[PDB]
Each structure stands twice: as C-alpha cells, then as structure tokens.
Amino acid sequence: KVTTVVATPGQGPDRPQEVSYTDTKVIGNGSFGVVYQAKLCDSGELVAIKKVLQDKRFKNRELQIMRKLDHCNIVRLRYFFYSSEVYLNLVLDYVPETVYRVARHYSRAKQTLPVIYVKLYMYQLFRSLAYIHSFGICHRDIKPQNLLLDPDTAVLKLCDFGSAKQLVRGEPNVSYICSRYYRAPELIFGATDYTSSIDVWSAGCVLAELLLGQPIFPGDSGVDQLVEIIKVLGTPTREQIREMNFKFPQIKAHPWTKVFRPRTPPEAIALCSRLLEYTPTARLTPLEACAHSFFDELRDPNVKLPNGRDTPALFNFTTQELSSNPPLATILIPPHAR
Numbered sequence: 001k002v003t004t005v006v007a008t009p010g011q012g013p014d015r016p017q018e019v020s021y022t023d024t025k026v027i028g029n030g031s032f033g034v035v036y037q038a039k040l041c042d043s044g045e046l047v048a049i050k051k052v053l054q055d056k057r058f059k060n061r062e063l064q065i066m067r068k069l070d071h072c073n074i075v076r077l078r079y080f081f082y083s084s085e086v087y088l089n090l091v092l093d094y095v096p097e098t099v100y101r102v103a104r105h106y107s108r109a110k111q112t113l114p115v116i117y118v119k120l121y122m123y124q125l126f127r128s129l130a131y132i133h134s135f136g137i138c139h140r141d142i143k144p145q146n147l148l149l150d151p152d153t154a155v156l157k158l159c160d161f162g163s164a165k166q167l168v169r170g171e172p173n174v175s176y177i178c179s180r181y182y183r184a185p186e187l188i189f190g191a192t193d194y195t196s197s198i199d200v201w202s203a204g205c206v207l208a209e210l211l212l213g214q215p216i217f218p219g220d221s222g223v224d225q226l227v228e229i230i231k232v233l234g235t236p237t238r239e240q241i242r243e244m245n246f247k248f249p250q251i252k253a254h255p256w257t258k259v260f261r262p263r264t265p266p267e268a269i270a271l272c273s274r275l276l277e278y279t280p281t282a283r284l285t286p287l288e289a290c291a292h293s294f295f296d297e298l299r300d301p302n303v304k305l306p307n308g309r310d311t312p313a314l315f316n317f318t319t320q321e322l323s324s325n326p327p328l329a330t331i332l333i334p335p336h337a338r
C-alpha cells in the first residue's frame with residue numbers, strides 16, 4: 001500500500017520531511033543491494049530507490065558525491081533516508097530507458113541508432129563528465145547501462161555513482177573498477193595512478209559501439225580485450241606502454257575509416273580516434289569533446305528532434321562546468337542559445 005518515511009532532501013539544508021510512496025516493485029539486484037521503483041503519493045512522480053547497507057564506520061561515499069551534484073545530465077537525488085543493521089535509501093528521479101536497452105533494440109532489428117541520437121546522447125554524456133571532472137570526481141564505471149534516457153525529450157542522465165570518487169594526484173586508486181568492454185588499457189594493465197581520462201576512454205567505447213551496433217573491444221578477459229584494442233590502434237610503443245603502466249603481437253594500426261561502416265560520418269571517426277588513445281594525457285577532455293565538430297549539428301538553431309519537438313537543454317553551461325577551459329564557451333554556447 002502506502003509507505004511513509006522521514007527523508008532528507010538531496011539538495012539544500014538538512015531538514016527531513018515526511019514522504020509517502022506506493023506501487024513499490026523491484027527493478028534491479030546487484031552486489032550493492034536492490035533498486036526499487038515507486039510512485040510519490042503527492043505528485044504521482046516516479047522514483048528509483050537504491051537501497052544499500054550502511055557501513056557504520058564511515059559516511060557513504062556515493063551519498064556524499066550525490067549531495068554535491070546538480071546538473072541536467074546527472075540523475076537527480078531527490079531524497080535519502082535510513083531504514084532497517086542500517087540501510088541507506090537513495091531516492092532518485094526515475095528515467096524510463098537506458099542507452100543499453102535502446103542500442104539493443106536497434107541491434108536486434110539489424111538497424112543502427114540514427115546519428116542525430118548518437119550526437120545528442122554522446123554530447124550530454126561529455127557534459128556530465130565535464131561537470132563531475134571539474135570537482136576532481138571520476139565516475140569509474142561509464143557504460144551504456146549507466147546512461148539513462150527519456151525517449152521523448154532525448155535527455156540523457158548519468159547514473160550509478162557507486163564506484164565514483166575524487167582522484168587526487170599522488171594518491172593510489174584501485175585498478176579493478178570499470179566494466180568489461182569499457183576499461184581503459186591502463187586499468188587492464190593494473191595501473192593505480194590513473195586519472196579521470198579513464199571515463200573518456202569508456203565514453204569513446206560507447207560512441208564506437210553506437211556507430212558499429214556492437215562493442216568495439218569485446219572479450220571476457222583482459223588479454224582478449226587488449227588483442228581487440230591492438231587490432232584497431234596497432235601495437236602500443238614502449239613510451240605509450242610507460243604512460244599506461246612483455247612481448248605484444250606486432251600488429252600495424254588498422255585505418256580508423258575501415259573500422260566503421262562506409263556511411264559513418266568522418267567527424268564521428270575523427271572524434272573516436274581522439275578519445276580511444278593509448279596515452280591517457282593525449283585523449284580529449286570531456287569539454288574539448290563537447291566542442292568537437294561531430295556535435296556542430298546540435299549547435300544549429302534550426303535542428304529539431306525526429307519526433308518534431310525541440311532539442312533538450314544543451315548550452316546552459318555554468319562557470320564550474322567550463323573551468324577546465326573557459327575560452328571554449330565561444331564554441332560551446334552558440335549565438336541563438338538562451
């Protein structure tokens with residue numbers, strides 16, 4: 001029936017409120033715990049409730065990160081509450097689809113996702129990355145399942161901050177983060193001195209996958225994944241290996257244009273090659289990726305969604321979001337942007 005709790009709003013001062021919800025059903029089970037869907041009684045708005053066991057010795061890192069985030073391309077923490085050992089419940093605004101589910105529909109129908117959606121989704125993913133990276137926060141698990149979508153508005157929201165953390169130069173970090181297909185080669189080599197550019201490699205794998213209709217670097221083991229990477233980028237040099245972290249197969253770099261289908265836009269291929277680089281510092285930053293020419297169509301004042309509606313918010317950048325390179329506001333914010 002109706003469940004009533006005293007929950008603290010995600011943003012603003014700590015002042016708990018009585019919150020009632022109903023139609024509670026399980027929508028996911030993972031190593032962390034369970035994710036439910038529920039409907040708020042007052043507004044009828046749908047929410048996802050991520051229930052995790054509370055450590056007791058320390059504050060939950062995912063909650064601390066979520067309370068600092070406020071961005072149109074990041075899933076909104078509406079409330080949080082504790083319940084029966086103690087459990088933390090993160091109440092997030094529900095988003096009905098994911099890039100994983102949508103890409104699977106196109107792949108099963110032997111069709112590719114239209115390039116207009118590839119531009120819209122990748123651009124919004126790079127904006128969410130620019131925002132979290134501006135605080136030193138690395139997501140560490142960028143993959144299609146963590147890219148929520150509203151199919152009507154074409155809004156994308158990054159979710160699952162269970163692996164996210166602030167990367168401080170000089171501090172070591174666990175290499176065993178990030179999921180199969182999307183792991184940067186420095187993580188496959190077990191590097192503990194990686195930077196936020198691991199999220200950019202993962203985003204590049206998502207872009208290549210949306211263009212190909214299948215993952216670009218598949219394999220259930222790191223050896224297989226690394227052989228697939230070497231087939232595309234060629235054997236990494238001794239310098240490139242040192243920048244990431246043995247006798248590798250001497251394979252020449254496959255021309256990036258031949259990796260994708262003939263109809264693939266060349267700007268999409270150019271963007272891929274600048275994200276999927278062995279040297280972590282050579283990869284584009286998320287803000288530079290947003291300013292790439294592959295996204296120029298999104299900055300045209302006449303562009304509209306295939307369903308006739310206007311594009312979602314794309315140019316409401318804040319000072320925080322542009323901090324890594326403020327002069328890019330000239331490309332990123334077009335003349336017509338309000």
Ligand SMILES: O=C(Nc1cncc(-c2ccccc2)c1)c1ccnc(NC(=O)C2CC2)c1
Nearest residue numbers: 028029030035048092093094095096097159160
């Ligand atoms: O945070 C959200 N989901 C989430 C977070 N963290 C971990 C998991 C997780 C991981 C492993 C296994 C199982 C679930 C899921 C979340 C928020 C808002 N809306 C949605 N929407 C959906 O799931 C619609 C149906 C596609 C989802």
